[PDB]
Amino acid sequence: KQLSSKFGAISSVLNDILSRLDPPEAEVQIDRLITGRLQSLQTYVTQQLIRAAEIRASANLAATKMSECVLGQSKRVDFCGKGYHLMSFPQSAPHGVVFLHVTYVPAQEKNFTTAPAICHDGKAHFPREGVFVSNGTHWFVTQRNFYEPQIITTDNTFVSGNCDVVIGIVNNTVYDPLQPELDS
Amino acid sequence: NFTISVTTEILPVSMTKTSVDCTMYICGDSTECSNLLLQYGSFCTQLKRALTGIAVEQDKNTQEVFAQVKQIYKTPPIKYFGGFNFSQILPDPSKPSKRSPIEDLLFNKVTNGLTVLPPLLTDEMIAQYTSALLAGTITSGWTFGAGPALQIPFPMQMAYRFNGIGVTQNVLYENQKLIANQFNSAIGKIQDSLSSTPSALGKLQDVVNHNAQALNTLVKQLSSKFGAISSVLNDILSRLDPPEAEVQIDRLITGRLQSLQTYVTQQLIRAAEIRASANLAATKMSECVLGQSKRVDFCGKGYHLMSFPQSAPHGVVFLHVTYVPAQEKNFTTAPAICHDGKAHFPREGVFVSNGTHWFVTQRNFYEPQIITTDNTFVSGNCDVVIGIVNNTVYDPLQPELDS
Amino acid sequence: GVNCTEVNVFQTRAGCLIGAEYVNNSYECDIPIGAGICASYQSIIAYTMSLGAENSVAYSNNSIAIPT
Numbered sequence: 130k131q132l133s134s135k136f137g138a139i140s141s142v143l144n145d146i147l148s149r150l151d152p153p154e155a156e157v158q159i160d161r162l163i164t165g166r167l168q169s170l171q172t173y174v175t176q177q178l179i180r181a182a183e184i185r186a187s188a189n190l191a192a193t194k195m196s197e198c199v200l201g202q203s204k205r206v207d208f209c210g211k212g213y214h215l216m217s218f219p220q221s222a223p224h225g226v227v228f229l230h231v232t233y234v235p236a237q238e239k240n241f242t243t244a245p246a247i248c249h250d251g252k253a254h255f256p257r258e259g260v261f262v263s264n265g266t267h268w269f270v271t272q273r274n275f276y277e278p279q280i281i282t283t284d285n286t287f288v289s290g291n292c293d294v295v296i297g298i299v300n301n302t303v304y305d306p307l308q309p310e311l312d313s
Numbered sequence: 314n315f316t317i318s319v320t321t322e323i324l325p326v327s328m329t330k331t332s333v334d335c336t337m338y339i340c341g342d343s344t345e346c347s348n349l350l351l352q353y354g355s356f357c358t359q360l361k362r363a364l365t366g367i368a369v370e371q372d373k374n375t376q377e378v379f380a381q382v383k384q385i386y387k388t389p390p391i392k393y394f395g396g397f398n399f400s401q402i403l404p405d406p407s408k409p410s411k412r413s414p415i416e417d418l419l420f421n422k423v424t425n426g427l428t429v430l431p432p433l434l435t436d437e438m439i440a441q442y443t444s445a446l447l448a449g450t451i452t453s454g455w456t457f458g459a460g461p462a463l464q465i466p467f468p469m470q471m472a473y474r475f476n477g478i479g480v481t482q483n484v485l486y487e488n489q490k491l492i493a494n495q496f497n498s499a500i501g502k503i504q505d506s507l508s509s510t511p512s513a514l515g516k517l518q519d520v521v522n523h524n525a526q527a528l529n530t531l532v533k534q535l536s537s538k539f540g541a542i543s544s545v546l547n548d549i550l551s552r553l554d555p556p557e558a559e560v561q562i563d564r565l566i567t568g569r570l571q572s573l574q575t576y577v578t579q580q581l582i583r584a585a586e587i588r589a590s591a592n593l594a595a596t597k598m599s600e601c602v603l604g605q606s607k608r609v610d611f612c613g614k615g616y617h618l619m620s621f622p623q624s625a626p627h628g629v630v631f632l633h634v635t636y637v638p639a640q641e642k643n644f645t646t647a648p649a650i651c652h653d654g655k656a657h658f659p660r661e662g663v664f665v666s667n668g669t670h671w672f673v674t675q676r677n678f679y680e681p682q683i684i685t686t687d688n689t690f691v692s693g694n695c696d697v698v699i700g701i702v703n704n705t706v707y708d709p710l711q712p713e714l715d716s
Numbered sequence: 717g718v719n720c721t722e723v724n725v726f727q728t729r730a731g732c733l734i735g736a737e738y739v740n741n742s743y744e745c746d747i748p749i750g751a752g753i754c755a756s757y758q759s760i761i762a763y764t765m766s767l768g769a770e771n772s773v774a775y776s777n778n779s780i781a782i783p784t
C-alpha cells in the first residue's frame with residue numbers, strides 16, 4: 130500500500146512522471162519519493178526485526194520446553210502445563226506448536242487430624258517420608274496424595290533424641306515388627 | 314549451626330501506557346494537515362496500531378504475572394502460626410488502602426499532545442492479589458495451585474520444605490523458637506534496610522525515570538523550529554501564504570514523523586526488554602512461590618526454602634528466604650567401611666569422625682548416629698576401594714532375638 | 717481522560733461512560749476498560765473487577781486434609 134502513496138509528490142507513478150516534468154525538478158521529485166519509500170522500508174524492516182527478535186525468544190522458550198517437558202520429566206510446578214506434570218505430547222502445527230499436558234489434579238479431599246511427632250517409650254518418633262494422619266481414636270500414616278492408611282511400624286519411622294521439646298505432641302501406641310516372632 | 318536471612322530481588326513488570334495520534338501531535342486543528350498527512354499513506358495508523366497492541370499486551374502481561382490462582386483466599390482470624398510472628402507482612406485493616414507497612418514504606422520511598430492511560434488493574438486489585446496469594450501460601454501449604462485448595466499447618470509445611478531441600482526435619486523441631494526469632498529479626502532488619510537505604514529500589518526508579526525522560530525529551534523536541542520559518546503551528550498559518558505554506562509545514566511534519574518513529578522504536582525496544590524481564594518474573598512466580606525450587610542460586614543466596622510475594626509500584630518486590638550454614642569444623646571422612654570382609658556404604662549420607670569413633674550423618678548437618686545395618690547396604694567386598702578404614706558395625710536386634 | 721461536566725452518565729477513573737447504567741453487582745469481566753472497571757452485555761452495563769469468589773479454608777492448631 131505504501132508503494133502507491135504520493136509522499137508529497139504530484140503522482141505515485143514512475144514512468145509517467147518522467148515525461149511530464151523537466152529533469153531539474155523531476156530529479157528532486159524522484160529523490161523525495163525515493164527517500165520516503167526508503168523510510169517506509171526502514172520502518173518495515175524495524176518492525177520485522179523486533180518481531181523476529183520476539184519470535185526468536187519465543188522459539189528459544191519453546192526449544193527449552195522441548196528439552197525439558199517432552200524429554201524426560203521435571204518436578205517443577207506449573208511450568209509444563211497447569212499443576213503437576215507427567216508427560217508432554219508435542220504435535221505438529223504450521224509455524225507453531227500445540228501442547229497436550231497430562232496433568233495430576235488431586236480432588237475430593239477429606240478432613241483429618243495430625244500430630245507433629247509420637248512420644249513413645251520416652252523417645253520421639255518421626256516419619257521417614259509420610260506423615261501421621263488420624264481420624265479418631267486410631268492412628269495411621271499416608272503419603273502426600275491418595276490417602277491410604279497404614280500401621281505405624283519401626284521401618285517407616287526413625288528416632289532422634291527424646292520427646293520433650295516438640296510442641297503439640299500426643300501420646301500414641303506404635304506396633305513393632307518381629308514382636309509376635311520372639312521365642313520361635 | 315544454621316542461620317536464616319532474607320534478601321530482596323526487584324524486577325520491573327509494567328511501564329506507563331502511552332497513546333499518540335498523529336494529526337493532533339503534528340498540528341492543532343488545521344485542514345492543511347488533513348489534506349497533506351494522507352499523502353504520506355497510513356504511516357501514523359501503523360504507529361497507533363503498534364501503541365494499542367503494546368497497551369493490550371501490557372495489560373495481558375499484568376494480568377498474567379499476578380493472577381495465577383482461580384480463587385481469592387482470605388486470612389484466618391487467628392494469628393497463631395506455631396510461634397511465628399508475621400505482623401508487617403499481612404495487610405492491616407487499619408489502613409483504607411489495605412496495605413502492609415512494608416509496601417507502604419516502599420510506596421513512600423518510590424516517587425501538550427500526550428495521553429496517560431491508567432492501568433487495567435489498579436493498585437487496590439494488585440494489593441488484593443498479593444494478600445490472597447500470601448494467604449494461599451500461608452494456610453494452604455506449597456500445594457494449592459494444582460487445583461482445589463488444601464490446608465497444612467506452618468511447622469509441617471516447613472518440615473516438608475526441609476525434607477525437600479535435603480536435610481532431616483528434626484532440626485526444625487529442636488530450634489523452632491530460635492528459627493522463629495531469627496525469622497522475626499531478619500524481617501525487622503530487612504524492613505529497616507528498606508526504610509533506610511534508598512538505593513535498593515533502583516530498577517523501578519530507573520525505568521520510570523527513563524520513561525519520563527523519553528516523554529520530556531519528546532515534549533521539548535516537538536517545539537523546535539526544524540529549520541522552518543516559524544515554530545508556532547498557527548503563526549505560519551496566518552503569516553505565510555496558504556499556497557506558499559506547502560514546504561515549511563511539510564518539512565516540519567516529516568521531521569516530526571521521524572521523531573515519532575524513533576520514539577516508537579525506542580518504546581518498542583524498551584517494551585520488549587520489560588516483557589523479557591516480566592517473563593523472568595513470571596518464571597520466578599511459578600517456580601519459587603508456587604512450590605519449592607531445588608535448583609541453586611535462583612531465589613536467594615543459598616538453599617531456598619520459600620519466598621514472600623509482595624506488591625510494588627510498577628513492578629514486584631521479593632523476599633527470598635535462604636539457608637546459610639555456619640560454624641565450620643574439620644573432620645575426617647572415609648569412602649566406605651568394611652565389616653567381616655564386606656564393605657558397607659552409607660544409605661544417604663557420609664561417615665564422619667572426630668577421633669577413633671566413626672559416625673554417620675545427613676547431607677548438610679551434623680547429627681552423629683550409631684553405625685547400624687538398616688542404614689547401610691553391602692555390595693562386593695572391601696578389596697576394590699582405596700583408603701578404607703576398619704571399624705565394627707552394630708547389629709540391630711541381634712541381642713534382642715536371643716530369647 | 718477528560719472530565720464529564722461538559723459533553724446514562726457515571727463517573728469513573730478513566731473518564732466516564734455514556735449510554736450505560738452502572739450496577740453494584742459482581743460478575744466476570746468481558747470487556748477490559750481500565751482502573752478495575754469492566755463491561756458486559758446481557759443492554760450494556762458497567763461493574764467493578766470481581767475476582768471470582770472468596771473461599772478461605774479453615775485453619776487451626778491441628779488440621780490436615782489429604783485428597784483421596
Ligand SMILES: *[C@@H]1O[C@H](CO)[C@@H](O[C@@H]2O[C@H](CO)[C@@H](O)[C@H](O)[C@H]2NC(C)=O)[C@H](O)[C@H]1NC(C)=O
Pocket residue numbers: 264265266267278
Ligand atoms: C478411621 O478410619 C479407619 C479406617 O477405615 C476406621 O477403621 C474401620 O472401622 C470400621 C468400623 O468398625 C471397620 O469395619 C473397619 O474394619 C475398620 N478398618 C480398619 C482398617 O481398621 C475407623 O473406624 C475410623 N474412625 C473413625 C472415628 O471414623
Ligand SMILES: *[C@@H]1O[C@H](CO)[C@@H](O[C@@H]2O[C@H](CO)[C@@H](O)[C@H](O)[C@H]2NC(C)=O)[C@H](O)[C@H]1NC(C)=O
Pocket residue numbers: 314315491494495498
Ligand atoms: C546458633 O546461632 C544462633 C544465633 O546466634 C544462636 O542463638 C543465640 O544463642 C545465644 C546463646 O545460646 C543467645 O544469647 C542469643 O540470644 C541467641 N540468638 C538469638 C537470635 O536468639 C544459637 O545458640 C546457635 N546454636 C549453636 C548450637 O551454636
Ligand SMILES: *[C@@H]1O[C@H](CO)[C@@H](O[C@@H]2O[C@H](CO)[C@@H](O)[C@H](O)[C@H]2NC(C)=O)[C@H](O)[C@H]1NC(C)=O
Pocket residue numbers: 398399400
Ligand atoms: C510481632 O512483631 C511486631 C513488631 O516487632 C510486634 O508489634 C509490636 O507490638 C508492641 C506491643 O504493643 C508495640 O509496642 C510495638 O510498637 C510493635 N512494633 C511494631 C508495630 O513495629 C507484635 O506485637 C509481634 N506479635 C507477636 C504475636 O509477637
Ligand SMILES: *[C@@H]1O[C@H](CO)[C@@H](O[C@@H]2O[C@H](CO)[C@@H](O)[C@H](O)[C@H]2NC(C)=O)[C@H](O)[C@H]1NC(C)=O
Pocket residue numbers: 667668669670681
Ligand atoms: C567424638 O564424639 C563422640 C560423641 O560424643 C565421643 O563419643 C563418646 O565417648 C565417651 C567416652 O568414650 C563415651 O562415654 C560416650 O558415650 C561417647 N558418645 C557417643 C555418642 O558415642 C568421642 O569420645 C569423641 N572423640 C574424641 C576423640 O573426643
Ligand SMILES: *[C@@H]1O[C@H](CO)[C@@H](O[C@@H]2O[C@H](CO)[C@@H](O)[C@H](O)[C@H]2NC(C)=O)[C@H](O)[C@H]1NC(C)=O
Pocket residue numbers: 702703
Ligand atoms: C582391616 O582388617 C583387615 C582384615 O582383618 C586387615 O587385613 C589384614 O591385616 C593383617 C594385619 O593387619 C595382615 O597380616 C593381612 O595380610 C591382611 N589381609 C588382607 C587380605 O589384607 C587390614 O590390615 C585392616 N586394616 C587396618 C587399617 O587395620
Ligand SMILES: *[C@@H]1O[C@H](CO)[C@@H](O)[C@H](O)[C@H]1NC(C)=O
Pocket residue numbers: 238239240774
Ligand atoms: C473441613 O472442616 C472445615 C471447617 O468446618 C470446613 O470448612 C471444610 O469444608 C471441611 N472440609 C471438607 C472436605 O468437608
Ligand SMILES: *[C@@H]1O[C@H](CO)[C@@H](O)[C@H](O)[C@H]1NC(C)=O
Pocket residue numbers: 248298299300
Ligand atoms: C501423655 O501426654 C502428656 C502430655 O502430652 C504427658 O504429660 C504424659 O506423660 C503422657 N503419658 C504417657 C503415658 O505417655
Ligand SMILES: *[C@@H]1O[C@H](CO)[C@@H](O)[C@H](O)[C@H]1NC(C)=O
Pocket residue numbers: 641642643
Ligand atoms: C581446618 O584445617 C585447615 C588446615 O590446617 C585450617 O586452615 C583450618 O583453620 C581448620 N579449620 C578448623 C575449623 O579447625
Ligand SMILES: *[C@@H]1O[C@H](CO)[C@@H](O)[C@H](O)[C@H]1NC(C)=O
Pocket residue numbers: 719720721
Ligand atoms: C470533574 O468535575 C467534578 C465537578 O466539576 C469534580 O467533582 C471531579 O473531581 C472532577 N474530576 C476530575 C477527574 O477532574
Ligand SMILES: *[C@@H]1O[C@H](CO)[C@@H](O)[C@H](O)[C@H]1NC(C)=O
Pocket residue numbers: 738739740
Ligand atoms: C451502589 O453503588 C453506588 C455507586 O454508584 C454507591 O453510591 C452506593 O452506595 C452503592 N450501594 C450499595 C448498597 O452498595
Ligand SMILES: *[C@@H]1O[C@H](CO)[C@@H](O)[C@H](O)[C@H]1NC(C)=O
Pocket residue numbers: 391393775776777
Ligand atoms: C492453639 O493452642 C493455643 C495454646 O497452646 C491456644 O491459645 C490457641 O487458641 C489454639 N488455637 C486454636 C484452638 O485454633
